[PDB]
């Protein structure tokens, strides 16, 4: 039962199953795993691929000799298993020299590090057949008002993107990229810090069609925010290339667990979601197995990831198949809500009396949105408590 | 000292000074005030102006002579104090039926209703001088998941907004539109819940030079968002065309405390960054005296907001120009956020061994930023505990 | 399938069903009910019993001629039905007297009315049958830091449930105190704002054995709380003396959504904690049908209310019946947890080398605490995708 | 001005000023700190003292000799600066060992370890002058709900705490133990959350009167909560044994800000209670220096935490001296509050026809509170902005 294969397009991070543990209050937990054994044991659960930081698969301050060395035996276990790398993504927030940032630091010769790290590693994610090129600019932003002049630091922001633009265009790559927003942690305030604010920053890129976002599942409700309701605008505007899944309980610091844990129900109406709308990119998770676990315990809580995700799949089109559903929705007229307003015109419905000098509105008051029946058929469906 | 005048640009809504004190749990405190003594009352303590709901300063179902005889009462308070009225907006909230939303109501009916009733109004605000039509769709969102499929919604708010785009260009009207971001209640989410989710969604408009935003303190905090770095990317955007001033103590229901109230030192970074940008809007009061208060602590608030601006204004300047602070500035280099980052461009960039293979990644680590002696200059400012 | 009964003592507040709709922002959506309707209605849907404040039962004002005849209906529909009312408590907040509170407003004379008007109300509870009374002292608190001494105010909420108390003593009356906590709303922060701050201040009263607490699901997890935790602390402290049962979406207004709605897997875990141990009090339900439903929707989601809750209690009692969760609980040593630390005692742990200088910490720190295998268990009896 | 003097009682942890800027994304900026040079950089700007961990002064695992010589040197440093240690603890928290807590890990030989590894840092603590031993258990709590029985766990954490008063009345030791509460971080919910749970739990140990609660500013803000009520609330049941001082900005991960930073108005009420109800005990910093600075930006941050507080002072006091605050307190009835509402007792109440049948609730519901003045001259004083 629930058994996820390849075709499912699970992905996950090196960083994720690979997590030692470390946290603000305590030392690892875990021992380094070698990349090579994650992506074994990682296709043996059924995933499709991994992602990776750069320094994840090459250690920082790596030789070109160690670094030819390191990649080499990663593709081999790629080879090995079938599995592939749809993503991958720079870190610009581990070492100190990234303490006020990478694109957005104040220091002038760190912003320009930070793209040269980037674009060596987007060269060799198009090695690796990676789709999209994920950023997380975790480090940009502040603790305090004076250190950072918000609108310079969007232009400094705006430079970087459009920089790798150019860089993507004049190589010819296919490759996309991915802002992935987060509200704050670890600065006080991170630039970009929710999927609008990220949407919004990339419609004055001078490419705008080269990036989406990579919304996730906890950062939006690190701002109490609906996720469901951030990834429909983000389809809405044509931009969700790529997303995290994981699970969170509400405003707090980033927890990262697994998928399915956290908001239950907010997983039902995404995976719903995700799937009506035809999504067709990674199922990826970006998690960590609580520090609490040994190795045992981490592919049990990877597992864990992919099962949630296949149970609620089920759920959901059950949910949307039952007749009794869909004559739920028409009573709540869902069906309404998808027809146009005034395609007539705006001078047919300034014309239309109906529409005010003879509208009924209390008689429209009146008719109830029977929107509690159905969200608990919603909930009987999720909890298999139907017939 | 910090007496407000008319051209400090305060302006306040009828139904700030004017709310009764109903809230979810408590009968009214107060009796409603006659918006011709508000607009005298408010123009002694300084103001510049007040804005309205349509239904503040007409009741809801009026006839046409009634109309006529309560909009000729208020041009007349206006004539007599200088007062000016340069934002209106529509309820289209408070009647029960927009109990699903105005704008994007299931019912496709309630929805053209509200257009109309947005356009009747958009009339009367060109009549009164308005510059500014607010949009805060309240009801616009759900409380469960089945309710509402949000890109549908947002398809029909793309409709209106272009519908209503579209009727001010007919009329060669000069006004334009802002929309109000609110992440939640009355609704369990709102549409357009932040000022990123606005501005992203303005780009998808038919014609977006005629929609900014109207963000308020409160409503970003209720998200726990940074609302100085909100404005910073409204204004980056070109699209703060008002703003609602007052302050909300973090995470919970809209409190609409007097401006200054809530997160002190938000005020302060806030009015510092207007002040700096060179905002020539409305500096408008969204608040509610408190339901403790008899109509003389009414006033005493709706004082206060102004007040609280004006110390501010004066700290922060004198923060900037503060000899002292500029060094700190430079320090922390803020000068270098301020340059670009690669004006030599891409090519020269990658050719740069200074960004990458010369680049001395632990000495740039070493060098501190500087931002807890600069915050604390600012906290001395702030707090009149400089020299 | 999940069909209620009385016997599974499911209550409702006449305030509950009974909501108009009127919040915040809008005007009532539905017409007042007629508390005996709500009685035959609930009575049909399988409820046990209700609950009402004074002013839910008889109207503000009401001459004792009035307050009779509506007592007399009232006690008619519940002799017709079967139905018990085991809680009752006083409207403290809703009248212009309350706004700066009852029993801790600034006013002494409010003070005394808010004691008399209670004191009344408890002779009508015991008439009526109830084992519980219930205070919210929705109102004591404070917008700002000079409105309210709060060591005054907790001075005089000691003197006025000490009172209470020793009426209740003198009239001979069997009936228990209990205090519902809530952090915020409608005033900016409630004095005992969560369970930890209200079992504290029991402490400190004359006859702590007379008093308990009324936590509320949504009441928590608006300080971002873990619900089942606090349940936990207060039946450690004997104190679970009534529950409120609703759904929450984490940290915003309170919501009071149907049981089972907002935090899901909170539900589930608050259903498992009260029959593990069994709490024999009312299953009270204190929540607001949305004021987009109609009636129908009104009767159905306080259907919903209950029959979440059987769902949830089947799924609990299978999670915990199932011999594979009980290896899984060995495993992560739930066994162990529930062993005294030292039951040898002080001077044999000082003594005990194996404790310390002898201890293997590493081999200790190695052991995997399986939690999340076992959480995964926990899903999948939630979701009913088991075997 | 605002110039620190020992007299002031100003501490801080050693692991405060030398926390290296690791965090969960991000290595150490800073090199390691001397305990040594720490003691002497806080002398020389004006600190009381120090506090630490076992682990922060004698690094885990040192043999006997070697803690002798850490502790030598230590003390050399104290007595060349006249510097105190008024308060030590545990850490129970970094070593991995403690991944699912110390006191209340489901492994009993970690909880026996954990009560060892206490009781010998008490009797160091006792040497070096210590009067408080603060407990904070940051293990304690779960990332799920079936890892973890809270009322189990309670009980194993009464057990330990009564041990521990047991054993420091066996060695007639006159130092005082306090409970640090957090609601999350690092487990993702913490038992005893708040200081309101910490103040119950305290009520059921053995002997109550060695207990209290060292609260943390940035702790319950965490939650929501307004600290200056819950040190109002300690305060009042005589608990406030210690208090650590710090900045946060709202419900999110632990900021540890430098104190007057975050919420600045909650800052000046909380010195405001403090100063007014005496408080004698140390005013100690747990709070981290950004990692963004250098060791000069740490001093200016550990020297802005003193500053702040003294400014407050000022502010604060001026407040309460002002003849026209103390007539606006007159105006809002804060002395009714501090008067009992029935000294005449109960019977003289119910007999009271002022309290009830003749009580004018309408006139009393028309007098103002007064707040919002009372409050803009509490603004005017914080901000240096009156005469
Ligand atoms: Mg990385
Ligand atoms: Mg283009
Ligand atoms: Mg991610
Ligand atoms: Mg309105
Ligand atoms: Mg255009
Ligand atoms: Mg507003
Ligand atoms: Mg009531
Ligand atoms: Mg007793
Ligand atoms: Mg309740
Ligand atoms: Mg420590
Ligand atoms: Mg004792
Ligand atoms: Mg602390």
Chains 1, 2, 3, 4 share one sequence.
Not at 155 to 176: C, H, N, P, W
Not at 254 to 262: I, M, T
């Amino acid at each position: 039962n629930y058994q996820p294969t390849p075709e499912d397009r699970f992905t996950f991070g090196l960083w994720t199953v690979g997590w030692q543990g470390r946290d603000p209050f305590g030392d690892a937990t875990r021992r380094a795993l070698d990349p090579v054994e994650s992506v074994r044991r990682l296709a043996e659960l059924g995933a499709h691929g991994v992602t990776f930081h750069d320094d994840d698969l090459i250690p920082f301050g790596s030789s070109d000799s160690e670094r030819e060395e390191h990649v080499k035996r990663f593709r081999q276990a790629l080879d090995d298993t079938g599995m592939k790398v749809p993503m991958a993504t720079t870190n610009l927030f581990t070492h100190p020299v990234f303490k006020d940032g990478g694109f957005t630091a104040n220091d002038r010769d760190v912003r320009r590090y930070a793209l040269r790290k980037t674009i060596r590693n987007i060269d060799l994610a198009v090695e690796l057949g990676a789709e999209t090129y994920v950023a997380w600019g975790g480090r940009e932003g502040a603790e305090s008002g004076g250190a950072k002049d918000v609108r310079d630091a969007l232009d400094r922001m705006k430079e970087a993107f459009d920089l790798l633009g150019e860089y993507v265009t004049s190589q010819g790559y296919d490759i996309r990229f991915a802002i992935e927003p987060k509200p704050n942690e670890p600065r006080g305030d991170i630039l970009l810090p929710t999927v609008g604010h990220a949407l919004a920053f990339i419609e004055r890129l001078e490419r705008p069609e080269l990036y989406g976002v990579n919304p996730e599942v906890g950062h939006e409700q690190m701002a109490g925010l609906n996720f469901p309701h951030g990834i429909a605008q983000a389809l809405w505007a044509g931009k969700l290339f790529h997303i995290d899944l994981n699970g969170q309980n509400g405003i707090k610091y980033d927890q990262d667990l697994r998928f399915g844990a956290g908001d239950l129900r907010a997983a039902f109406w995404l995976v719903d979601l995700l799937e009506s709308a035809g999504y067709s990119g990674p199922r990826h998770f970006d998690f960590k197995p609580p520090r609490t676990e040994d190795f045992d315990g981490v592919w049990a809580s990877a597992a864990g990831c992919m099962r949630n995700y296949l149970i609620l799949k089920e759920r959901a089109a059950a949910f949307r198949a039952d007749p009794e559903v869909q004559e739920a929705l028409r009573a709540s007229r869902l069906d309404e809500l998808a027809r146009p307003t005034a395609a007539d015109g705006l001078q047919a419905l300034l014309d239309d009396r109906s529409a005010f000098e003879e509208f009924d509105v209390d008689a429209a008051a009146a008719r109830g949105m029977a929107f509690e029946r159905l969200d608990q058929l919603a909930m009987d469906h999720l909890l298999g408590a139907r017939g």
